[model samples]
Target: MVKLRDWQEKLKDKVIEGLRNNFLVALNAPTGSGKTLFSLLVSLEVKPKVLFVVRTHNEFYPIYRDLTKIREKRNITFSFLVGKPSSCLYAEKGAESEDIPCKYCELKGSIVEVKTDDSPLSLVKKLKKDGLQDKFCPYYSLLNSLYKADVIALTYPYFFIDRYREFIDIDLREYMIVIDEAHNLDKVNELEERSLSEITIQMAIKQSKSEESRRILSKLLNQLREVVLPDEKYIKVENVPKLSKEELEILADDYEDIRKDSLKQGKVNKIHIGSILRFFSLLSIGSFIPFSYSKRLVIKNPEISYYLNLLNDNELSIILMSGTLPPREYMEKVWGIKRNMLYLDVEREIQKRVSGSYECYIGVDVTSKYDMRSDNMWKRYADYLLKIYFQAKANVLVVFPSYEIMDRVMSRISLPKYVESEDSSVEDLYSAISANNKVLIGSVGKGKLAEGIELRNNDRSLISDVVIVGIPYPPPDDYLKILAQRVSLKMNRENEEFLFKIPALVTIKQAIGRAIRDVNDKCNVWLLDKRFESLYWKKNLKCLNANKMKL
Candidate 1:
């Protein structure tokens, strides 16, 4: 049996109390303090069907393992619900034929598989093994399991998005929701629409054997090329130029029929003529939302509001838990929640049973800003890192602002065997670090290594020191700048703190949090940027304020 920490035990009753009285609860805790274990314990007390949601598939394994461990005594059924790409049998076999459905997909737009009477752990393993043997849809099995499962864990997109709504068997209103790594669900307004690439579209046009598909596709290419200028390959206008009603009708009419007829005749067509036609049809409504144009076009919406609206629409009990969740007031404003929320910020530090102290330092002269950056400045930074490397007794992580800066500074430094995070898988990076006491270099906010990742050696903390290169500030021209300005002007908020500093602070805290995961683990953190010393940035680094020491 696992033992709960003092803080974990304290928060357990609080969470249960909140769930008993209210519909939503927000639990904020530091990294490596075992929020997952705490929340799982709470789930057991409140006997409701649990829908544990995560931001990505990479996080699923850890949660699955934790659930398996708890299930040793708990009689609740649980299963993982991933999408077609990961769970489909035909996808595993490298089958790409779109005409015929897999053997398990007996019904279109729904899963027809029945739930297994076996235990949750055995059922998950059995489904995976049996599906690989026969051409069965593992995704369908996951969907079917929802009917009988006491707990169903899936990624955000699988539950939130409209396309996959048909597959879900349970009404969210009846389920208690636990969103792990809840900060990832925090809102942004980048328009991400699914569409084919230009090269792929061109290839499809080239391979078009049917005359009708060829004509439609050729016209699409012509119209697309006409809009994108020769020198400026892309342009982001306020809106798409309005087409006449007659022109719009002509574009939208009979396109669906054409696709159907072509499919029936089987005229050897590889191109999705309907997708091309749908693009044109959508152009009529493009003026409804803000959009960006590049190699492809995406209509931008207020995505934060979009997600928040989805949550508001559902009456399910929500528990938004994260290590670095911002203030409750800030979260309320960002998430667009008008209703009063139950906020509990746990301040208990991990009680250490080992012989080590947590130390923090800020370099007074380091700056990576455009005008101030130089080879000498970077060299000095490298020397500082070497100092930490010499002083430290365990593995270290040096987080740079970007890949460009990491590359620039790494060329100037000389240290022990160091592995820098690059175009490598998460498993490979962790494996590499485990093999040796190498210093790991990674870019802040640009990779998985910066957040939601734990490093350990011999079941203890692997990282002993973390060095942040500079302020991981977003570009001035980014949409967040505008978002900050608007929120400041409209809502009467702090401009620099909201627009610029908050994002950087969140990342810094998260990076430094990599160390000192457990009470027995210890680490020292170094902030290389001079900006962190200023009152403007320092005050916002709330968690580290008490422990912060200038060097």
Candidate 2:
């Protein structure tokens, strides 16, 4: 095993003290803070089962492989909960199975088997007859398999912080919870969330135009709109605490009818509306996050039950770790650590190999003189990027805030560049990353290539052309705003201080930090946004001094 760095060792000591003192610790560090190392130390110190929850299948596998590589008890395990219910494995014998390598499963007593497929309703019926869902449904069968594992791996929307509670025993308060990418929680409200907009719905209706479709959609829109409006009543205005079973049935039937009609039309709806649909689909799963004001314009809400309640019931300790959780407030909110909670922010331990040769240039304009929407925008950015490509000997990376903008930039530039979208297949992206003279153009929060850890083990010198198109203070008008706001709100919930300033400046700071992974990294930050004037620059610098030269 590799020796731990100074920061990692310090973090390990603090975590040990925290375990001894019985304090839930939240570690807030920037990019290259060595959070993964700190996490390993925590697991080793406690020798207890740890659940490292991330966001996707692609992400979980990497972390699982890393942790399992160390020589330790063969019994330590990882269980990933994803996909539709049928595919969800309850608990599989980790090594016994040919498909996955998890040999020590907490849920499996001996053998594992796929179960029958049954809806929740059918499961209820089966439970009444045969006792539990394990009798049917491969999804439940799979989940049942891993429910007892010592260490379970999961994403934001998959496990306990949200709807998965009803499906699993989150009541097991004894386990240590390590929230990686802890900075993400500040604005990550709604474990399972959905949003409906009048515009998107109206577009769906306009596209359909059928009388039946129109009639059902009109009523559905009114209901959905009312549910989401700033001020409106989803439930009856009257104070009726008790709803009879019959009344509930009537409402469900109406909702079901509306859902069927909407879904029928939705099957053919364009991709633009898919974001809104996904938002709603998550909401259907369940979220307890309450909507609250971040300020006058920004609204922040987190749907999962904050660990605050868990602290009261059990001797729980939270190990919150993240790279790029620069602002301490952002880290605090994500971990749900109170004002009295212990906090630590360690400086990056990696030394710059440049031997005082590193350069710093700031307050320069990377913004193109031409309008980005013009046909020449891509051509112009590409031409400029290629010029910089030859200037540097390492691999060149041109980061953009949007795929559309990236497409324009790529159209004009001449290079063996590759474009990656949040929705793109992993096989294709990995292949693109491996190609010669590769220029990786990626987005901020697309789940696959977002913040924290994408650059792990990557060679900085290989990136010869590093062109990053800045994300404007205000995101471009699109459905992505919903996901952005989701992150912003979660951050706000974690750090009330940054809550109000978010979307305006802090988000910009967070986004830019993606390029400068650590203090040792030397790169010119070319900001294309017109908003990077002295006044705008001061807003970010006033909070923290970021060493950079703009051009």
Candidate 3:
């Protein structure tokens, strides 16, 4: 078995105790704190099975790595379930996670016995390569394997999203659930939110196979166009358009027909019918409430308890772990998560020895507040970024509040830059880093680059400084406004701490975490908003002693 630290072992007893007593245990463990290994150990003790749920598939390997160590001594059946996008045969030909050509799928009913020792990354390549040529279906084969697993690793959707959860017919009560990066539990509603822009509607019209379906889509598009305003940021549309049941059925049939036709021709076309289908489905069911943002129709779930309520059975045991999670009181107040949960701030001092410090600095001059933004302010911000870029020891990650502000400011500063865009993947970021000796890796806060990724070269984190361009608040949209009202009513007039502050704090913490992946790794954190100087911000960020500096 893997040798767990003394602190981890002690924490394990408390964890098992909490689980046995039917309580959800939330562990605020620092990054690189052996939380993966620690969770594995807890799984061993609790043991009917473990459902190790993570934010992304990229996290699956680490759990597998630790489980391998445990397997050296004991017999542990470990497996993972990959999403359709990863395991699908036609994924290379434009198939997406949600719009997979399920109806036309040929790979089914057979289980290709997988090798237990292979990592998820390796298995994906093998599954795809094998399934491509008359072998068993990669997705279904993996799904079959998950049932036999004593421990199953899956992405967040598998356990949280009901449709995806149905893919695995397993009871939560039968498994000890460990949710890695559990801070997102409250934001699943936001994560699942969909938007339909004018461009998207146009695309849907262009792709519609049936003229009948096309007319339905066009009518819906015209309705969306009616509600959208002239030249404003956003507008509250109390009554967003809805499709008749008959129209929706026609649309669905047309979508399936389009998919069948494409697959017959050995092509997997990018069809937008699925997009509108999903949107209308959610709207029809009253699952999502809609609003208008510029030229788009945004549909989001304002309900706090809509996403994770399935996991709330008293018999189920769940461990919500993260580097920074909402406080227990905050959870009840904002997120409406009222279950009895044992909060464990795992002794992070040991982790401090494992991952480096923030070496935090609060920039007092600039802020991204709406009224304060301007061409002059953007130029000054650009000047400061260049100043930091030159002075930093290695590459620097400049985190912005939004893409608009990012583009406005970043356009002025010229350097070997890898700016964030919808199409830019993390792999592209690493390639940019590898290609350029020094680069400005720019991204928005709470985004993939700013939070989850570590821009590293070999073992060394490429970023020596994480410059927060602003306070990384969520856009003041009608959806969030509605969410705020719902939250406020629930709190008896509330935590933008729920809607804003905690999120800002989480993003900065995560951004800072990117540059300090190892104890030996070190980086500087520059909070570019004067608002961060507040006692509330400092105390919550745990950087009250941070150097107050002027740029």
Candidate 4:
């Protein structure tokens, strides 16, 4: 194992000691601060079983890497679970989901003990090959290991989402749950953000074989088509169209029969009836309310309290860690975290690896306020990007508020650049960078680029300047407006701070963080939105020395 850093050696004892006093610990450690290594050392001392819950599959590599380092000193058993879609050999050949007829499959129960020393991709590949050769199921192999492994790592859904959590069946109380990028707990609403449209209903009508199912779908289509909007973009829908229990039961039977027949023929489409069924399922939950957003039928739970309550299990010991977590006050008032929590900011004894220097600037003349946007505004933004592009040290990453604004402003510029798509992948960015050493990259604020992976050339970050076109505040749709009103009344505070500023600040910091990754990294940060000049933003960002640019 590599030697511990100065901060890790000093703070690990304090963190572990704090754990004994409080079941919940909020460690506000910056990214690249050896949070993983320090956390491993700290967690192992607190509990025999440590479950590292992270945001993505990419995060699994670090846990395994650090564990391998620790394994040199002692034999520690560990395993990570891969979803059926990614690891199932049946999914590889012709079947998908749990519909693969697990009862009759020859490889269903083959569970083999395997080494957990490798990257996520490598482990999956090895497990898949081992299972295929031995006529075993890799998904079950990993699933079975969770019951006995000393340490386990899995994505957020395995623990956060109730259905998947129950499927794993390992009582979380048995293991110390360490949540990485813990700020995501604030956006748990995204898990239940479900929507249905007229087109989907119409399509379901066409796909249904039963006249009864088609009639119900047609009724929903007419119901949606005749509904008038109270708001231009979105509004809270009081009465959403749904099927009766008997009607849904008939559709479910038909949906399953068709799926089985399609499997026999070795081809089946989305089974749109299933889609219709899932959207209606939200109606069963009291917290979720359907909404009409731009002609689509969507369901949203304005409050995240229901999800927060899941963490209130008395037996569970959790360590929530993040770089820019919400203020403890916000969690108590809005998030409603009632459990005992010890907050540790870690008094500056650690070796710091945050960006070494930041040359910051804020544009006083620019803004992306909805009512204030215009073609002239788009041209001015293009001018700023061109001006910054010429002076940048290496690659430049320009993040926008939304794709609509991005299209208008980006079309005005002639720079050869890689603009992010709806389904943009990290490989596409790397491919674009390798093709041209100096490239201008366009992305959105709440995107995959938001601190998951690094854009690097061998050791250092390729992005030298971060040009934020606007504050990526939450859109003022009905969902957010209602959410803000409810939360504000609850907190007895102003709505603006909770609804806009804090979220925008997190996004801006994430953009700036793209450039300044470590102690050797220096960054050029330009916040194009004028709102960033406010004392609140300035103090929170700690950018009191930033240049005030009129353009």
- lDDT against the true structure, each candidate: 0.59, 0.46, 0.78, 0.76
Candidate 4 colliding pairs: none
Measured on C-alpha atoms, candidate 4 has an lDDT of 0.76
TM-score of each: 0.74, 0.60, 0.92, 0.90
Per-model root-mean-square deviation over C-alphas: 6.3, 10.5, 2.6, 3.2
lDDT of 1 by residue, 1-551 (tens): 27777777667777788777764777777655677777777876675677888766556565556666674454776666755544544333322223223332432234446453555445556666676565455666677767687777777766655545556777776677788766665533322232323554466466555555555555555545444332211234354334455543443343434334444452313334434444445454442232333345444443354555555543657788876676666665566655546777766333422123356677878877778898888788777777887887777788887666776777776665454553455676677666655665555454455354666657877777888887787655324434444344342345455555656767776776677655565677787877777776655553255344333
Candidate 2: global Cα-lDDT? 0.46
What digit string (tens of lDDT, one per residue) describes model 4 on residues 1-551? 26876666777777888777655788877778778888887888887889998988788888887877773345678788877767766453323354444555566677788667667679899887877787778888888888888788898778777778877858666687899988888777766566787877777778778898887778878887655353434577777665788988988887777666665553434556666777788667776877776567777788867677767676777888887788887777667788888777743454354445688899989899877799998889999998888888788889898777888888888876888984577888878877876778888776655358877777888888989897887677777767766665532356667767778878877677777767788878888989888888778887888899986
Error of 2 at 416 (Å): 5.5
Model 3 misplacement above 4 A: 71-74, 229-235, 348-354, 489-496
List the candidates ranked by lDDT, beginning with the highest: 3, 4, 1, 2
Residue 501 of candidate 4: its Cα lDDT? 72
Better lDDT candidate (1, 2): 1
Worst 10 residues of 4 by lDDT: 92-101
Worst lDDT 10-window in candidate 1: 92-101
Per-residue lDDT over 278-394 for candidate 3, one digit per residue giving the tens place of the 0 to 100 score:
777777677677777656777778776677675567787888888878778877766666778888887653443445777788878888898899898898799889988888898
Off by over 4 Å in 4: 71-74, 92-106, 198-219, 225-234, 261-271, 346-353, 448-450, 485-493
Q: Which candidate is the best by lDDT?
A: 3
* Candidate 2 structure quality by residue, lDDT tens digits, 329-393: 44344334443456676653333221111222232445533344565555555655666666655
The better-scoring model by lDDT among 1 and 4 is 4
